[PDB]
Design a binder for this molecule. Sequence first.
Ligand SMILES: Cc1cc2nc3c(=O)[nH]c(=O)nc-3n(C[C@H](O)[C@H](O)[C@H](O)COP(=O)(O)O)c2cc1C
Ligand SMILES: Cc1cc2nc3c(=O)[nH]c(=O)nc-3n(C[C@H](O)[C@H](O)[C@H](O)COP(=O)(O)O)c2cc1C
Ligand SMILES: O=C(O)c1[nH]c(=O)[nH]c(=O)c1CCc1ccc2ccccc2c1
Ligand SMILES: O=C(O)c1[nH]c(=O)[nH]c(=O)c1CCc1ccc2ccccc2c1
Lengths: 313, 313
Amino acid sequence: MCLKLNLLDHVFANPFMNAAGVLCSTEEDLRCMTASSSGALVSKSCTSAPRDGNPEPRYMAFPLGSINSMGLPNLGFDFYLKYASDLHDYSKKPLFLSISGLSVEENVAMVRRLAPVAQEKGVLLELNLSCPNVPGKPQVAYDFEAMRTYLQQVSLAYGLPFGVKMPPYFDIAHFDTAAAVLNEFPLVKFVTCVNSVGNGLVIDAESESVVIKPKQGFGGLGGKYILPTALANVNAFYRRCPDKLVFGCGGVYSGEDAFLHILAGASMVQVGTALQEEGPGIFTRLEDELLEIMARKGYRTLEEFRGRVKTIE
Amino acid sequence: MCLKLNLLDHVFANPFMNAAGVLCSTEEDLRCMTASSSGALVSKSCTSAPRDGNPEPRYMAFPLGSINSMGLPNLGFDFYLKYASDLHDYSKKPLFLSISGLSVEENVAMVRRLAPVAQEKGVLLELNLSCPNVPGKPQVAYDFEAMRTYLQQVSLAYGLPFGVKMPPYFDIAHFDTAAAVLNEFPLVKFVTCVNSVGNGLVIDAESESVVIKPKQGFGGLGGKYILPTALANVNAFYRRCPDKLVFGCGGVYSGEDAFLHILAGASMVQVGTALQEEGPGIFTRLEDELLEIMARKGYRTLEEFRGRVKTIE
Ligand SMILES: Cc1cc2nc3c(=O)[nH]c(=O)nc-3n(C[C@H](O)[C@H](O)[C@H](O)COP(=O)(O)O)c2cc1C
Ligand SMILES: Cc1cc2nc3c(=O)[nH]c(=O)nc-3n(C[C@H](O)[C@H](O)[C@H](O)COP(=O)(O)O)c2cc1C
Ligand SMILES: O=C(O)c1[nH]c(=O)[nH]c(=O)c1CCc1ccc2ccccc2c1
Ligand SMILES: O=C(O)c1[nH]c(=O)[nH]c(=O)c1CCc1ccc2ccccc2c1
């Protein structure tokens, strides 16, 4: 009994991977993720130039989850490309490279250079749409006409199947609009739902203070706080994008949580906060737990139950 | 040491009240909230005509919060107007009446008839801007032009101070835009942040099923899930609306949670999910708990710490 699966012309030992941004910034991190029992890894979202990111403290975690305003600290695209091209051992597991340029031009520039490496090595692109937009405007994925432009320009520039990392939505009409944008692009083969729930605020009662320094304490939420949000987005896009895969991310701490993601429609299941907190050993626990729940239910495959969440009447 | 507040030309023994929708639909419910130690009460969001609401099950609760798609079940405006005009004992505490017309014209018709009762008895209006509007459009407060229309029309028709109940926002550009719309309306004297976090999905692993029947299991989230999101919204509007009060709602289960709201900027503190779960006895507990935190810190009044959350450097 094993959890192996095939997606996107790659084979995976199991559906688990890190979430972008967690345990994936440096060569050390990527080698640690590659040594883990995860089925795949994704690199830290990158920009063309290296970034220091925001002042510390910029991440904090608590029993119910985490908050962050990292500010896209990363080693720069040339580093992640070199890692994909020369350093990653593809015999161990697939690699996803995450890009988050500050403009459409920057994304085009990076994807033109990634294309030949994707062809030669099979690295997979995850395009992070929680990225900077023009004056007055919300993040790109919350501006559907900007989103359409990014995807048009990246599709043309890259020319190969890729995925998109989405922020959560909270309104059925937004689900409908966003999925219709995505379904305009045949090269968008997977949608990862969700990025952190934007601009929450954690306050420490004793100190009477916010707990992260940037943005007056406001930052993206992950962990237990966000699991029903994440399940809703996974299922909403699973229903709306039948020709695409959905990757679930948000609130996974156990095999049971992974089970719920898969029942909602998830093909791969990403682990952010709980991975940051527990470390890469989590992957063996999650695999064991998921297999245990499958066994108790009589499921032998993921495909027996993926997307098969039941509704009432 | 005391929890008293004076605002909106009323006096409140303490800042706690029910959140709209919870323990406020029937005369029995309203009498119960009136008999409780809460500092105020709000009636169930109403429509002109009575509504049965959505099929059951339509509310469920769990350790980390609740999900609902109640569908605005209510006894109709005339009932809530009568309660305000003839039944409520204003010597016990103040009363808010929440309205949630399905169109701007339905809201105008109701506010026109509320006005004289507001003027004579002092009932306070809370306009719910999570009213669905046209299906396939976002809820009203996620459509800034609709929101502006609603506020213009209601301000003209009512002519008296009122407040608004807001959904959470997740993007700084939305906080900026939403507050700016509200700040166009001088009669909007309070802003209640937040309504439920929209379209979450809870899935029960044993049964492999969603837990509520409407909308394929999608519904609004409350409780522990939503506290950092609620805090963020309270503080975002507190900072952006210096001539308005903010009332906090979301995730309050303890005096400490209430303290965090109030440090964020809350004047009144509303209690939804935890009240639904625990019953009106929660109000004595919350008061005691908040007074205990005040005593430890040496705070004698709420205003000593309201809005006084610290940021880092
Ligand atoms: C410290 C940190 C850094 C992150 N950086 C990124 C990033 O570079 N790119 C990205 O797509 N998402 C990023 N995220 C979002 C996560 O990939 C994930 O979507 C989010 O944390 C929700 O999953 P979780 O509940 O498992 O934490 C980051 C999250 C954290 C906590
Ligand atoms: C069962 C139920 C009914 C609700 N009905 C309404 C309503 O009629 N009007 C409204 O403004 N908010 C309504 N809400 C939202 C609550 O007022 C509140 O904003 C939300 O539950 C978050 O607070 P909490 O975390 O304390 O539950 C309802 C919530 C619940 C759980
Ligand atoms: O690095 C982050 O703060 C981060 N945290 C998340 O929870 N999700 C993300 O997607 C990101 C990075 C998003 C991002 C993407 C591009 C950015 C560009 C300039 C400044 C900040 C930028 C931030
Ligand atoms: O009555 C509700 O379902 C409700 N629940 C909340 O968590 N907050 C709200 O503001 C409301 C009332 C607004 C509302 C919310 C959902 C609805 C679904 C179908 C039909 C009408 C609806 C009206």
